[PDB]
Amino acid sequence: KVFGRCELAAAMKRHGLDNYRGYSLGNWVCAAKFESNFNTQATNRNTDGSTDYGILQINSRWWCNDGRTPGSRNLCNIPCSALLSSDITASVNCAKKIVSDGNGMNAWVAWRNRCKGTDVQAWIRGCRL
């Protein structure tokens, strides 16, 4: 599913991402924009042979099982395919674990490079939340 910006904002808020670990909703929407362009089905291969899955490009190196990332962990205890569903519940639950790991949203390199320090409130502008 390709979410609308305000559609994804509402879904993230419903699932308790708004101000989770102190990150405002706009941070999460900005991260999803640059990770996936709001596409739940987004997959990208990393140089290390790990793969990033779903709206928040969660990495098989640590967080989900895809069976093809040698030496990897599955800390969200989920198949990486569950991160591609039209229902973002699994992505959000796993994102809560990632952002709690000690480096906050710096875990998402595209958040650090493209959202951090910017006017992230713009991403929820005009949304009925």
Active site residues: 35, 52
Number of residues counted as binding Na ion (CB under 5 A): 5
Phi, psi dihedral angles at 52 (to 5 degrees): -100, 135
Q: How far is the CB of 21 from Na ion (least distance, A)?
A: 23
Question: Is 101 annotated among the ligand-binding residues?
Answer: yes
By rule CB under 5 A, what string of x and - marks binding of each residue 54-73 to Na ion? Answer: ------x----x---x--x-
- Contacts of residues 97-102 at CB distance under 8 Å and 24 or more positions apart, as own/partner, are 97/63, 98/56, 98/58, 98/62, 98/63, 99/20, 99/21, 99/23, 100/21
* Residue among 39 and 66 whose Cβ is closer to Na ion: 66
Q: How far is the CB of 96 from Na ion (least distance, A)?
A: 18
Order of strands across the sheet that contains 58-59? 43-45, 51-53, 58-59
Residue nearest to Na ion (CB): 72
| Residues in Cβ contact with 67 at an 8 Å cutoff, skipping those fewer than 6 apart | none
Residues lying near Na ion in the complex (CB under 5 A): 60, 65, 69, 72, 74
**Sequence ranges of the binding site:** 101
**Sequence ranges of the binding site for substrate:** 101
